[PDB]
A paper describes a structure:
However, it was eventually possible to crystallize apo-NadR, and the structure was determined at 2.7 Å resolution by MR methods using the NadR/4-HPA complex as the search model. The apo-NadR crystal structure contained two homodimers in the asymmetric unit (chains A+B and chains C+D). Upon overall structural superposition, these dimers revealed a few minor differences in the α6 helix (a major component of the dimer interface) and the helices α4-α5 (the DNA binding region), and an rmsd of 1.55Å. In the apo-NadR crystals, the two homodimers were related by a rotation of ~90°; the observed association of the two dimers was presumably merely an effect of crystal packing, since the interface between the two homodimers is small (< 550 Å2 of buried surface area), and is not predicted to be physiologically relevant by the PISA software. Subsequently, analyses of the pockets in apo-NadR revealed that in the absence of ligand the long Arg43 side chain was always in the open ‘outward’ position compatible with binding to the 4-HPA carboxylate group. The ‘outward’ position of Arg43 generated an open apo-form pocket with volume approximately 380Å3. In summary, compared to ligand-stabilized holo-NadR, apo-NadR displayed an intrinsic flexibility focused in the DNA-binding region. This was also evident in the greater disorder (i.e. less well-defined electron density) in the β1-β2 loops of the apo dimers (density for 16 residues per dimer was missing) compared to the holo dimer (density for only 3 residues was missing). In holo-NadR, the distance separating the two DNA-binding α4 helices was 32 Å, while in apo-NadR it was 29 Å for homodimer AB, and 34 Å for homodimer CD. Assuming the same DNA-binding mechanism is used by OhrR and NadR, the apo-homodimer AB seems ideally pre-configured for DNA binding, while 4-HPA appeared to stabilize holo-NadR in a conformation poorly suited for DNA binding. Overall, these analyses suggest that the apo-NadR dimer has a pre-existing equilibrium that samples a variety of conformations, some of which are compatible with DNA binding.
NadR belongs to the MarR (Multiple Antibiotic Resistance Regulator) family, a group of ligand-responsive transcriptional regulators ubiquitous in bacteria and archaea. NadR binds the nadA promoter and represses gene transcription. In the presence of 4-hydroxyphenylacetate (4-HPA), a catabolite present in human saliva both under physiological conditions and during bacterial infection, the binding of NadR to the nadA promoter is attenuated and nadA expression is induced. Each NadR monomer consists of six α-helices and two short β-strands, with helices α1, α5, and α6 forming the dimer interface.
Residue numbers in the entry:
A (entry chain D): 9 to 83, 92 to 144
B (entry chain C): 5 to 83, 92 to 142
The structure:
Amino acid sequence: SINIGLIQAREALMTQFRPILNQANITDQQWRIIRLLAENGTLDFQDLANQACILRPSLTGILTRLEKAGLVVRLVFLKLTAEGEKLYEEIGEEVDERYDAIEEVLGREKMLLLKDLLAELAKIEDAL
Amino acid sequence: SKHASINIGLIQAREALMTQFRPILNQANITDQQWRIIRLLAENGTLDFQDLANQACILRPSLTGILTRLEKAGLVVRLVFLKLTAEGEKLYEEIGEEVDERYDAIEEVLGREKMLLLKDLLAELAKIED
């Protein structure tokens, strides 16, 4: 029920977001990594894997491409490059415009509630 | 930036939920997608191929292959409509009982009422497909 509702909600969101990702030729997972490194200051490999919800064997390859593309750099801690910061703001702007279009219909109040409930649900491992 | 990520928020919520369900599904030879099909076939009784694909969010070629496996195991049968077998009904009730036990554990923490609201809000967010 909730499992399925989650996938149905994100899938409907993803179909309209996928054309955007192809214009920068970045994948979903790459975008999550890019955004997380921006919304956080810096993140190590394990923490990045946990928050991006990417398996450790998969994350290494993805990170390598982002560094070859000069978007992410290793120092083990990871952080966006100057260019990575710019890419995040441009794509993020389109997403905010997308967020605004949904909030205009769904309702600002319902939208805020959805954010809180999704955040609490993610946190329920430590709380169990 | 301005507003939080819905993309990331959605996937983080589900991963934490799947973490509580994977040990149950792995003790049986069931995958996430297979379980999704089994529940949908149970809540509707019977579903045709296209309708099943849309609700389980599984691509038609992939759905076909999974269905072939579920029939080899004698859990699903074609009639084009799909339905659980008698044993399929048994597996759903058996696995479902273990799954329900985890929902109760989560709801004790998240809140029984809030859990219900989240389903509604996700459906509304989902219906604004456009």
